[PDB]
Structure formats: C-alpha cells, structure tokens
Design goal:
The structure is a monomer. This protein is of the alpha/beta class and 236 residues long. It has two domains: 1-39 and 131-236, HAD superfamily/HAD-like (Rossmann fold, 3-Layer(aba) Sandwich), CATH 3.40.50.1000; 40-130, Calcium-transporting ATPase, cytoplasmic domain N (3-Layer(aba) Sandwich). It has ten helices and 13 strands. The strands form two sheets. Strands 1-13-12-11-2-9-10 form a seven-stranded mixed beta sheet, with helices on both faces. It has a six-stranded antiparallel beta sheet with strand order 3-8-7-6-5-4, covered by helices on one side. It is elongated, with a radius of gyration of 20 Å. Bound molecules: magnesium ion (MG).
C-alpha cells in the first residue's frame, strides 16, 4: 500500500518514513497536559456571580475562538441565557476580551477568570481541562521509556492530572521557552525524545523534539484523528 497511506488509515499524517524507525530509537515521551492528555476544549467547573453577569461575559466571549471563550459560551448557553449584542469588541488572545453592552463596559480576563463591569470585578469562573479516557496505554509504555508531562498550568492542576493518569515526572507553570530549554537539556543528556503537543503554544519545543507529534486540534506526525491511544498503541 505505502507507509504514507497505511498511516493515514490509522489517522496519522507522516512527514518522512524516517520518523518510522526513529520511533524505535527514542526513549523519552513527553506530553503537553493541555490538548493531548485532555480534550482541546476546557469546561467551566464553577461560576460565581449573578445570571446577568453570566450573560454579559458569554456575550463578549462569543466573539472569540479561544477554547476558554468557547467553554464559557457553552456553559452560559446550557444555563439558558441568550447572547446579547456587543459593540467595540477587543481581544488579546489567551489573556482577555472586552466589549460594550447596554452602555456598560465588560471585560473577561485571566479562580481562573474574572468578569469586570465598568472596572469592578463582579463574577468569576473556575475552568478546567477534561482528561481523555484510556489509561492502560500508559502502563504498557511505562513497561517498554520515561514519560513526562509539561504544562503552562498551575502546580495543583498539573499534579492532580499526574495523580489520576499515574505519572511521576511532570513540570508546571512552564512558558513555551521553559519547555524548549527542557527539550534541549534532555537531548543534551542523550535522550531521544518524542513529544506530543498542540502544535502552536509549544511549536518550538516540538521543533526540537527528536520526533514530534502535533494534534489535529511542520511536526513529524500529525494526529488528524486526535487518537492518542492509537499513537501510544503504535509506540508500545
Ligand atoms: Mg463549559
């Protein structure tokens, strides 16, 4: 058939056949918490504030394509509130959004998210990543090979996910640049490192991985399917 076509069938897009046997020569596996071990879109785990505030925040968040923004919009919609007309929308990706509704200035910006109305913090959200099911693939590889979780998220969130999925080595509160330095150090130390990430917020780290995998949500392997199990199946 052809390696390239066989891999597509399994929802992997490969860049070079070399990545193939290179898989066997690697010894370290690194996961990005967000998007790989968890779904690409987080959920609202709690909202504190009144329903008008909720409608205001969702109405502004409805103009962003950020996953946190989508988590907030979905939660508000499940609560039954309707989207309101916003003017003067402004966004700074991943950090905050702003807009005007009913003569009032609303800001939603990085509990995890505060809602301001005319300068005053009046509501907030806790949002969390949702883990992907399938937990045995991990042990299998822990058999055959060291696993590491990296994340720009806070200690307690990262640790807790490490706890659930049963992963020992993990680093938290990392900037993209922290991750890149970690890869280089592993490679300096002699490790052949395969990394799985979102493909953007950690593109430099991937670019340095011995073999890099991007989620479907440049890299050596693109997981169109977002099927990590099948990737870990292959590796294992
Ligand atoms: Mg949600």
């Amino acid at each position: 058939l052809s390696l390239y076509e066989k891999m597509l069938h399994k929802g992997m897009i490969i860049k070079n056949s070399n990545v193939y046997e290179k898989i066997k020569e690697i010894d370290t596996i690194i996961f990005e918490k967000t998007g790989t071990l968890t779904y690409g879109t987080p959920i609202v785990t709690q909202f504190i504030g009144d329903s008008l505030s909720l409608a205001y925040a969702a109405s502004v968040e409805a103009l962003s394509s950020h996953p946190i923004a989508k988590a907030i919009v979905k939660y508000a919609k499940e609560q039954g509130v309707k989207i309101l007309e916003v003017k003067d929308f402004k966004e700074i990706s991943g950090i905050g959004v702003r807009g005007k509704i009913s003569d009032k200035i609303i800001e939603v910006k990085k509990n995890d998210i505060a809602v301001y109305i005319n300068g005053e913090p009046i509501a907030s959200f806790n949002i969390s990543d949702v883990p992907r099911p399938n937990l045995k693939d991990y042990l299998e590889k822990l058999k055959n090979l060291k696993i590491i979780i990296l994340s720009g998220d806070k200690e307690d969130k990262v640790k807790e996910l490490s706890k659930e999925l049963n992963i020992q080595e993990y680093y938290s509160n990392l900037s993209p640049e922290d991750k890149v330095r970690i890869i280089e150090k592993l490679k300096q130390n002699g490790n052949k490192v395969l990394m799985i990430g979102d493909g953007v917020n950690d593109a430099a780290a991937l670019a340095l991985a011995d073999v890099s995998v991007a989620m479907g949500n440049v890299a050596d392997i693109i997981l169109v399917s977002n099927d990590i199990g099948t990737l870990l199946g292959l590796i294992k």
